[PDB]
Structure 1
Amino acid sequence: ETHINLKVSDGSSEIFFKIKKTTPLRRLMEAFAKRQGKEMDSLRFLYDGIRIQADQTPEDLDMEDNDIIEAHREQ
């Protein structure tokens, strides 16, 4: 009830994460990116087609269970 499960996909790598709904998305952004050795800012993350700010929290975006976050390479 207090946490949230989210799927991050770039069309090639899809990974599930579980985070607090009151914590910034940044951790989820970083762990996914740093797995590939890239910086977080070298990747654009979209929820419903809208860029996600790092300081944003899941409850700020009305995120639901088993929601999907799209990842795209920048530049």
Structure 2
Amino acid sequence: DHINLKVAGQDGSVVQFKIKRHTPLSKLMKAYCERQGLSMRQIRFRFDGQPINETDTPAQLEMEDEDTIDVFQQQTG
């Protein structure tokens, strides 16, 4: 079935990603990034501690229902 992944940025934004356990997290990152209007290389996604790979999946990272994903900004320079 569908899994609910809670993605949070740096504010009180609680978006619920209802995707499939076999759906690449790369698309999840892009979906959120596109909604914000930024480049996928301008931000960074992390799962608990380890950063998400461009080929990672909910079933790969052993993500459960109602899990959480952290979104950080890339340093200017």
TM-score with structure 2 setting the length:
0.88
1:11 pairs with 2:7: no
Of Structure 1 and Structure 2, which has the larger fraction of its residues in helix? 1
Residue identity in the other structure for 1:32: Y
Deviation of the 1:4 alpha carbon: 0.8
Structure 2 unaligned blocks of 5 or more: none
**Greater Cα radius of gyration, structure 1 or 2:** 2
Superposition pairs of residues 1-75 of structure 1, within 5 angstroms: 2-12=1-11, 13-75=13-75
TM-score with structure 1 setting the length:
0.90
Identity of aligned residues (%): 47
After superposition, give the CA deviation of every residue in 1:4-36 in whole Å (9 maximum; x if it has no partner): 100110121221111110121012101111111
The separation in 2 between residues aligned to 1:19 and 1:26, in whole angstroms, is 12
Q: When the two structures are aligned, how many residues end up with a matched partner?
A: 74
Structure 1 unaligned blocks of 5 or more: none
Residue identity in the other structure for 2:59: E
What's the RMSD between the two structures over aligned residues?
1.0
